[PDB]
Design brief:
Elements lengths: L7 H18 L7 H16 L3 H11 L3 H19 L2 H5 L2 H25 L7 H11 L5 H10 L2 H31 L7 H30 L6 H22 L4 H14 L6 H34 L5 H29 L8 H9 L5 H13 L4 H32 L6 H25 L10 H7 L10 H28 L5 H15 L8 H8 L4 H13 L5 H27 L2 H29 L7 H22 L6 H12 L3 H38 L9 H28 L1 H30 L4 H18 L11 H6 L8 H10 L1 E5 L4 E3 L7 E7 L1 E6 L4 E6 L3 E2 L1 H6 L6 E4 L3 E7 H10 L6 H21 L7 H9 L2 E2 L7 E3 L5 E8 L2 E3 L5 E2 L11 E3 L9 E6 L4
Antiparallel strand pairs: 1-8, 2-7, 3-6, 3-8, 4-5, 4-7, 9-15, 10-14, 11-15, 12-13, 12-14
Helix pairs in contact: 1-2, 1-13, 2-3, 2-13, 4-11, 4-12, 4-13, 4-16, 6-7, 6-9, 6-14, 7-9, 8-9, 9-16, 10-11, 10-12, 11-12, 13-16, 13-17, 14-15, 14-17, 16-17, 20-21, 20-28, 21-28, 22-28, 23-28, 24-25, 24-27, 25-26, 26-27, 28-29, 28-30, 29-30, 30-31, 36-37
Amino acid sequence: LHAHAPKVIVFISGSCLFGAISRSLFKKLPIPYTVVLLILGAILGVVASNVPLVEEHTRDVAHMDPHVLLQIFLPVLIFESAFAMDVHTFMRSFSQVCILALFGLVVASVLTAVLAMNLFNYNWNFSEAMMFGAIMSATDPVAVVALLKDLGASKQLGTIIEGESLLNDGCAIVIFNVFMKMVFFPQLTSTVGQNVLYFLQVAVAGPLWGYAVAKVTVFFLSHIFNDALVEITITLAATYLTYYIGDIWLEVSGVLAVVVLGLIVNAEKTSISPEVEVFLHRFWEMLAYLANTLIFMMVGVVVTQKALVAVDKMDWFYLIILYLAITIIRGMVISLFSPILSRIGYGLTWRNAVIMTWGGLRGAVGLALALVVENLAGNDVIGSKFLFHTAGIVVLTLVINATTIQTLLRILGMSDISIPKRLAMAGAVRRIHEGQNRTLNMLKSDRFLADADWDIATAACEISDPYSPSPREFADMMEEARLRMLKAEKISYWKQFEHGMLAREALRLLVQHAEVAADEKDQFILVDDLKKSWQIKGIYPWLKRKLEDLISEHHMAFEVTINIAIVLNIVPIIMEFVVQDKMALQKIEDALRISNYVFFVIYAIEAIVKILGLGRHYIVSHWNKFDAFILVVALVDIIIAETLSSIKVVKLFRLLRGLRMLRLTKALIPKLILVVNGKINNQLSLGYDVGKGYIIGEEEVGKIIDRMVDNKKILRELKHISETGRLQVVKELGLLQREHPGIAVSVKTRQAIRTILNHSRETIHELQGAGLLDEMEAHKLELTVEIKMKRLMNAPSSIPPPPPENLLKNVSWLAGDMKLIDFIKARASLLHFDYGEVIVREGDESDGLFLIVSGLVKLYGKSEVFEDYLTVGNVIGEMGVLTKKPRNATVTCETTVQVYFITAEDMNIAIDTFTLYPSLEYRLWRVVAIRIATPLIMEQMAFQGWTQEKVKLHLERGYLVDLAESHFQFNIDATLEDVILINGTAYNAHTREEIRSPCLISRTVHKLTFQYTATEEPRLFVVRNAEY
């Protein structure tokens, strides 16, 4: 309670209250709240100049040390800016931002510096003018990206402006740091070589240091389970130690390190627990908000105390001229590079350039650097002028540029809402309005709410729309069909995502392509544009093959023990020689000489044991030759040390590093192979998600448009485009399996578990929603799911492809029936086929089954109408042997192929032999039945909200009826959902109407009767309601 109390708290706490007041009072007014904070800070400053008591509270901030200002606020501002943004659209447009942020910053700064030299009468030198330019070129576009996120062009113009701001803020501090030393801390004139190393440290070592710290950080985040506090604390510690260690100890650019760390930790959001990801965004937003309020408050105080005392009348004239100049300079730079930017990324239109030119608001980062000059100036007038102009420009930009950006967007015609969005919002609002009427009518019947005031209720719950054969005939219908197709596709991608079938990156790629296609004439989604997702860069296969060659050459303990021995031996090999470089402690240092002999003996025993185990074959492996040369050198230098100028010592210093530490590469190379596998896996995993998402999208939409577009000539074209896309996608993804078998298996197993766990989570919420499972108990199981989700990210990047005999075990109708697996495995024969060979042809009798264990085969049949590709795991000929009808399609190998062949005679014997309740006949028809059934139920369900998987899960509940038990079937709405005829022909009992084999049965039909025939025996599939 004495005067020693921390008076900084009242300021920090008071700043939060003032920020809240300014943010709430001016929420609907156009002027940003940050300007109000500057005025409040000025009021506080003039007050503090007159009432001593308040001065005691501002003192600890209004005269804050620069090397606490920068070390605390800047890492927060830069990390939040890096952590908040969309990295993937940023990386897919990286070069355009780099061109306009690095080189754009240089020209903008130099031009501002020249202006500051020539116009202003302050007689500044080029170092000071470059500090001025660096401060004046730092942008804070938050107020503009916020609008662009809502109105439109969010994935194009929002990211470039935000990324440009991020990079220009990062580089401005570097320039400001460089020129601050040459102004306030001038050293002796450095050599050109010294300067070059200085450039490498700030420019190259910074990003490398940040990259290393990030890759270490994400590694540990991936191994933290059920501990959110540790994750948040690790993020904080990593971000603050990256700046401190990089800036103070390593003499490396801290800001750029944090930029890279934030970007990487954003890109690897999957390694963070989902519940902590949603917390980190709000946490860093809050820290940045605190930082901004303090900077504006401090600026408001210090300008009033010690900046405005030195402003002359002509200084205002320069401020206006400077404001005009930097705005002109920014637009000049954007236009001058515009020819270059037009060729890379999303080129800038003239209206986009104006928004960027007008949207370049200045903010805290600029002001923070101005406070450094004010403090380091030591009451030299340079400090006042720096802070005066930086505050002036910020106020002008916030009062003029920010307050008119919305009207400029309206004028330029970018604030309009597209008809599709307006219709979607209107329909959603109307549906919401209808839903409330249903609820209100239901509530009015409740006994305990009959006395409620329904006028107030109805007024309160209202939701209002926020946005409130001729050539021409054929051209218009084509456009309507095209846009309706694209809109249906976008719906499918969202349904797939909401049910966990796609990762978000695949969703955003697919949606971006759909929207881009919508905006171009006669443009559908082109698989050639999607191909970039699953193209593997050539460097990684090459590295994998080379590194496997290096490592593809007895006890378990030797390698681990010795590798530990080496990794520890770095400690002597550093601490002796580094201190010897200073001695050039001897009472202690000689102990390391003695222990060096013990390490020699360790490696010697290792070599002796290895020679004994390998015997004469020790020389066969080149890796061991180095293992012997190391011992030779160690013995040689030990003899010199024991038995006997500098050549006897410096040689030791060098050799006991060179031949000492390079033998860890044996252990390392496998880790590099794993990293390379991971890089391929991350690209191949995205490829499958995008490709498979596209195929599902096309299959779902193709069943919709049959009931949306009237003109058949339009209808044929659209379904032609969908099919020519589907085939190319399924082929490209099929080939990648042959290129990278094990990584494909890893991807496919990872998708499988990801699906199982998601559906597992739904059952918990169903049980929790039904009250069978308490809230806490459900939470305890839901954690077990989420930990298992996080362990998938750490699963091996390659699973060795199972041998052919394993695939038979995992076939659907062979699963779990050992006596049948043994029967088939014995009689199943493996066949090899070369490229272009036909396995079977149309019209051939059904000789047997083919189980593709490797390769890719092309199906082509007249049933050119039919065309498809099948790959590992799929089985060909099931319909054939069951019905004994001829082949459906010709099968051609697109790659060297292996197939397990089971003769139709073996199948018939197996069908006769294995006749328990889950009969092999029942199983083979069930697997066939669902494939035939799924298209029909999906065609019926086309208008409704299910995905294809919910249609399958709906079908999996079904069963085949034993029409031998009763040769007629009757339907009941209360206990039966739908019925599908799979093979045969069926008669409605009341009319004997012809229903042919593939038909789905209409719900009006009551009773079905069949003809007792053997040649086309009736097979029928049925699904009961969940209540049986």
